[PDB]
Amino acid sequence: GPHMATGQDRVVALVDMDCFFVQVEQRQNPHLRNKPCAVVQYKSWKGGGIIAVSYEARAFGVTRSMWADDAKKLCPDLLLAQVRESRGKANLTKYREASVEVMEIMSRFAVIERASIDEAYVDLTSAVQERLQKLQGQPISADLLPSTYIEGLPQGPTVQKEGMRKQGLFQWLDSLQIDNLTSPDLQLTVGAVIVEEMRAAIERETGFQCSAGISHNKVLAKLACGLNKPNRQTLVSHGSVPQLFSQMPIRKIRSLGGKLGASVIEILGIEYMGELTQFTESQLQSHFGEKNGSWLYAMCRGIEHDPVKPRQLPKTIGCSKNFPGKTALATREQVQWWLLQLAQELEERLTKDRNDNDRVATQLVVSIRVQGDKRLSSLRRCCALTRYDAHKMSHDAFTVIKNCNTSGIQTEWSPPLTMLFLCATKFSAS
DNA sequence: ATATGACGCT
DNA sequence: AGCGTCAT
Ligand SMILES: Nc1ncnc2c1ncn2[C@H]1C[C@H](O)[C@@H](COP(=O)(O)OP(=O)(O)OP(=O)(O)O)O1
Ligand SMILES: [Ca+2]
Numbered sequence: 001g002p003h004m005a006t007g008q009d010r011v012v013a014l015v016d017m018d019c020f021f022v023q024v025e026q027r028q029n030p031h032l033r034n035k036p037c038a039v040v041q042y043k044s045w046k047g048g049g050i051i052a053v054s055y056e057a058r059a060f061g062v063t064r065s066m067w068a069d070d071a072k073k074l075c076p077d078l079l080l081a082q083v084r085e086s087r088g089k090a091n092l093t094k095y096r097e098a099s100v101e102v103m104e105i106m107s108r109f110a111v112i113e114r115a116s117i118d119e120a121y122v123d124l125t126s127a128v129q130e131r132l133q134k135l136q137g138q139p140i141s142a143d144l145l146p147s148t149y150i151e152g153l154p155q156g157p158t159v160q161k162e163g164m165r166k167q168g169l170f171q172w173l174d175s176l177q178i179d180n181l182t183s184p185d186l187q188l189t190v191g192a193v194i195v196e197e198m199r200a201a202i203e204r205e206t207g208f209q210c211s212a213g214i215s216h217n218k219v220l221a222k223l224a225c226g227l228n229k230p231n232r233q234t235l236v237s238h239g240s241v242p243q244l245f246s247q248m249p250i251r252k253i254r255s256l257g258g259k260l261g262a263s264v265i266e267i268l269g270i271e272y273m274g275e276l277t278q279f280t281e282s283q284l285q286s287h288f289g290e291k292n293g294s295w296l297y298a299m300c301r302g303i304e305h306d307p308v309k310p311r312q313l314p315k316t317i318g319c320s321k322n323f324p325g326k327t328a329l330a331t332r333e334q335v336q337w338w339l340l341q342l343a344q345e346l347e348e349r350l351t352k353d354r355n356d357n358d359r360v361a362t363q364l365v366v367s368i369r370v371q372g373d374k375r376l377s378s379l380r381r382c383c384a385l386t387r388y389d390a391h392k393m394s395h396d397a398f399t400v401i402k403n404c405n406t407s408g409i410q411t412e413w414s415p416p417l418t419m420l421f422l423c424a425t426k427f428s429a430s
Numbered sequence: 431a432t433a434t435g436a437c438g439c440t
Numbered sequence: 441a442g443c444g445t446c447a448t
Contacts, residue, residue, distance in 0.1 A: 020448090045432055067431085083433095090433065116435070116448040258446055291438090316435060324432040380442055423435095 007216055007303030008184035008238050010125045011191035014221035015198070017102060017118035017210045018230035021052035024098045025081035027207045036060060037079040040068045041090040047072065048082060055230050087341040089321045092117075101206050103312055109198045113309045121218055122198075123308035124191045131190050132181050139178050142169050144193045149228045152240040172235075185237055188214055192235050199233065217304040222254050241302035245274035253299065260292065276300030313357055318423035319346045320367075328371050328416035332405070335413055335420075336398055342422045343394035350388045350424055361385050361424035366397040368404065369419035376419070379404060385424060397422060 017023065021039040026032040036057035040048030047068030060075035071078055084091045099117045106112050106120055113121040153168030177183045191214045203209055212233035213224025223244075224236040236244065250273050251261045265271060267287055268279070276284070277300050285293030298304060319342045329335050354360055364385040369378040381400040385393065407414035 016448095042432080049432080051433085092433070114435095119448070255446065260445085314435065318434065320433060322432080327432080377443065382441080421433095 005303070006184075006238060007298070007301070007305075010123060010216055010308075011128050011187050012215060012217055012221045012308060013122040013124055013191060013195050014115070014213045014218065014225045015106060015120050015122065015195070015202075015210050016212065016225050016229075017208055019052050019054050020098075020118040020208075021083075021095055022054045022081075023208050024095055026054070029081065032079055032081060035079050036062065036075050036077060037081065038062060038068065038071065039081050039083060041083040042085075043082055046070065048080070051083070087344060088338075089319075089341065089345070091345065098206075098208075102202055102208060102210075105202050105205055106198060107312060108201070109194060111308065111310045112312055114312050114314065121221065121308045122195075124194055124214075125187075127194055128187050128190045129181075131194065132187070135190070137178055140173060140176070140189055140193065142166065142173060145169055145189075145196060147196065147199070147232050148192050149232060149234045151224060151227055151234055151236045152243055184216065185239075188216070188235055188237055192233065195233055216302070218306050218308065219254050219299060219304045220302060223248075223252065226252075238302055242274060245300065245302075246272060248273045260288065264288070264296070273300055315427065316423055316425045317346070317349050317353060317361065318421065319343075319349070320419065320421040320423075322369075322419045323416075324418060328418045329420070330413055330416045332411050332413055335417060336394065338420055339394040339397050339422070340390060342420055343390040343397065346393065346422050346424060347388050347390040354388070354430060358430050359427040360388075360430045361427055363424070363426035364393060364396060365421075365423040365425055366400050367419075367421035367423070368401055368417050370404070370415040371418050372415060378419075382425075385426075393422065 022037060025039055034056065035054065037054045038050045038057055039052040040050055042048050050062065050064055050066045050068055050071055053062045053064060057075055057078055062071045062075050062078060068080060084094060095117060103112060103114060103120060106122065110122045110124055110127050115121055148169060149165055150168045150172040153171045154164065158164065158167065176186055176189060178186060180186065195212050195214055199210055199212060209231045211225050211229040211231065213221040213236065214233065215221045215224050215236040216238060220236050224234040227234045249271060250264055251257050253273055256264065270276065276296055281293060281297040284296045287293065288296060321338065321342065323329050329338060350361060362385055363382050365380060365382045367377060367380045369376060383396045383400050405413050
């Protein structure tokens with residue numbers, strides 16, 4: 001009753017760039033705009049591995065982790081853009097730089113948490129309060145929400161997409177309690193008005209479109225974001241949760257897409273997130289541990305407390321390449337040449353990072369994978385990173401792994417290496 | 431048939 | 441410290 005917390009204390013958004021690498025390439029090359037197209041890496045491998053897909057190409061069944069030659073069988077007129085290759089490997093600089101463009105714009109509105117190359121969470125709680133004061137209790141016109149969906153509406157006693165969107169939005173707004181500045185629903189609404197403005201600024205200043213979710217915490221914000229894509233935003237209210245969760249596969253909730261989620265389903269004999277509400281907090285803790293059980297008990301009720309972390313920059317800067325099948329690294333001289341290649345890119349990214357962001361990495365993590373391990377991470381070791389020099393980094397990396405070689409023959413490497421990974425970590429202010 | 435990044439556990 | 445999980 002009066003002491004039951006409802007998880008309605010913050011306004012949180014998740015902004016997600018639509019088919020991001022595709023948009024970066026389509027901005028650059030107007031001939032790709034409004035076409036089925038994809039971004040590929042490593043051309044000579046069956047036309048290249050597809051890593052991003054325009055929405056026009058998705059309608060043909062083109063997906064990520066399809067070979068371009070195979071995608072062409074579904075979509076013969078698919079256009080392609082290829083990732084830059086430097087020193088024999090894919091180089092994602094263009095996309096990291098485009099990401100900075102977007103993250104700098106979002107940072108003007110609120111403090112962001114960089115979640116990936118193209119996602120950021122936003123804590124809008126404070127900006128909502130401030131915008132609510134300015135508003136002076138005047139209503140919110142639908143015109144302030146031109147791309148917003150209200151999940152679960154319309155409901156109760158037209159047949160085209162936009163018509164249904166507006167119907168839901170009218171029911172939502174007609175019901176709003178603009179009289180109370182502490183109404184959660186009103187706070188989410190104003191949050192959505194801000195996110196409209198944020199998304200318009202991104203598109204104006206970059207050409208890039210995105211989707212967004214607005215709710216009371218990160219999990220619901222992320223869920224909401226995926227509900228109406230591309231180029232749209234979705235508001236998931238607290239009151240929307242019971243219906244939304246009643247048929248929501250558990251695996252759709254962030255952190256449940258893998259093994260834990262699969263064990264929730266199997267152990268408990270359930271399918272949908274809402275079905276969790278019938279278990280006590282102690283039962284969930286018993287099955288899944290103290291932390292996971294507490295988290296699940298609250299989350300199935302729409303409640304989650306993970307903060308939007310004030311962090312706009314990555315905490316690690318890494319470079320890696322796989323060397324599959326026959327290309328696996330079999331000689332000492334190959335291993336050293338590729339470590340050098342990785343180390344050169346790393347040095348380049350590190351030096352840029354030091355000038356831009358006033359910090360230095362201090363630990364180098366070296367990871368490899370020998371042929372056999374189904375296992376991705378076969379072995380991991382660190383050393384000190386004391387100088388941004390590619391030859392030292394590559395030599396150091398070699399030293400900390402050189403005894404993984406089982407070959408009595410000096411010049412050979414056994415078993416062959418199928419992955420090398422160099423990662424700069426443990427940043428200090430500079 | 432074939433590249434990153436964050437965080438949890440021990 | 442080194443390994444595992446989950447995600448873009
Ligand atoms: N497994 C991967 N390997 C390489 N690059 C990837 C991988 N997954 C994602 N990316 C890159 C390419 C994407 O454009 C970008 C953002 O990922 P993601 O948001 O999952 O897809 P997307 O932005 O391309 O489509 P969407 O409209 O579904 O957001 O990161
Ligand atoms: Ca995206």
